[PDB]
Amino acid sequence: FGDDLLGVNSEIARKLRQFYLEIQEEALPARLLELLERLEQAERFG
Amino acid sequence: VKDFKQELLLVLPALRAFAISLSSKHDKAEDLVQDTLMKAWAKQDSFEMGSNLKAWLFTILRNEFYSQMRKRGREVQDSDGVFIESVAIHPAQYGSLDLQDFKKALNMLSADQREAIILIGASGFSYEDAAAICGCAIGTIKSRVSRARNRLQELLKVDR
C-alpha cells in the first residue's frame, strides 16, 4: 500500500493525532474568548 | 450575526494547536492566534460561501506567522545575530505522549515539512486543501508529507 502516505496503521500517524489532541486538552485562554466577545459587541453597536 | 462567532469557537481550539505546532518560540504562539482572530473578524465578509472556513482561518494564521518570522529575522540580522528557538509544553494531561519531545522532533524538520505534516497528519485537511493553504501543488505537499513522516520515524525512533 505505497499510495498510503500517512500510514493508516502507523504509529507516527497516531502520535500526530495524539499531539494535536493533547494541546487542545489545555484551557483556551480567557483573553482570546473575551476578545471574541468584544468583537461581537462592537458589531452590535453598528 | 452570532453565526460567524459560533463558527470560530468550533475552529479556535484547532487553530491554537496549529499555532503552537508551527511556532519556534513557546511564548509567541498565543499572540499569533489573537492576531489571526482580529484579522479574520475584519475580513469575515470576504469569506467565500461554501468554502472551507477552517482552511481560510489557517491560511491567515500561517501567513501572519511567516510574516513575523521574516520581520524577526530582519531585526536579528540588524542586532545581536542569534535566533532563539524555545520549546515549553506542559506534559500530556490525557495520554502518555511526550509532548516536549514530539515538539522538539517537529522543530528538527524543515519549515515546509513541519507545516505539511501538521496540516495533513493532524489538522485533517485533504491534499487539495493543504496545497491551497501552502500555495503549492498537490504533488509538493505529498512529497513533503512523505519526507516529514520518514524523518519523524527516525527522530522518534518508531518503526511505524
Q: How far apart, in whole angstroms, are the C-alpha atoms of residue B35 and residue B82?
A: 25
Structural domain of B21: 1-160
- The answer to whether the Cβ–Cβ distance between A17 and B158 falls below 8 Å is no
Q: How far apart, in whole angstroms, are the C-alpha atoms of residue B29 and residue B6?
A: 22
- DSSP assignments along B52-117, one per residue: -HHHHHHHHHHHHHHHHHHHHHHHHHTSS---------PPPSSS---HHHHHHHHHHS-HHHHHHH
Q: How far apart, in whole angstroms, are the C-alpha atoms of residue B94 and residue B18?
A: 19
B138 in Cβ contact with B131 (< 8 Å): yes
Q: Up-side HSE of residue B96: CA atoms within 13 Å toward CB?
A: 0
Q: What cell was used for B27? A: 511564548
Q: Quick one: closest CA in B to A22, which residue? A: B92
B68 in Cβ contact with B28 (< 8 Å): yes
Q: How was this structure determined?
A: X-ray
The label of the residue with cell 513541519 reads B114
B61 in Cβ contact with B18 (< 8 Å): yes
A29 in Cβ contact with B30 (< 8 Å): yes
B130 in Cβ contact with B120 (< 8 Å): yes
- The answer to whether the Cβ–Cβ distance between A5 and B102 falls below 8 Å is no
Where do the domains of chain A lie?
A: 11-44
The Cα angle at residue B115 between residues B83 and B146, in degrees rounded to 5:
120
Count how many domains chain B has: 1
Q: How far apart, in whole angstroms, are the C-alpha atoms of residue A22 and residue B90?
A: 9
Nearest Cβ partner of A36 from B5, B89, B93?
B5
**Length in residues, chain A:** 46
Contacts of A40 in chain B (CB under 8 A): 2, 5
Q: What cell was used for A22? A: 493533547
- The answer to whether the Cβ–Cβ distance between A11 and B158 falls below 8 Å is yes
How far lies B56's CA from each of A8, B11, B15, in Å? 27, 11, 11
Of B33, B133, B52, B129, residue with least CA distance to A24 = B33
Give the minimum alpha-carbon distance from A17 to chain B in angstroms, rounded to a whole number.
5
- Per-window interface: B 105-124 vs A, CB < 8 A: 117-118, 120-123
Q: What cell was used for A10? A: 502507523
- DSSP assignments along B27-57, one per residue: TTHHHHHHHHHHHHHHTGGGSPTTS-HHHHH
Chain Cα centroid distance, residue B63: 10
**B109-140 as b/e, with b when 16 or more CB fall inside 10 Å?**
beebbbbbbbbbbbbebebebbbbbbeeeeeb
The Cα angle at residue B111 between residues B109 and B114, in degrees rounded to 5:
55
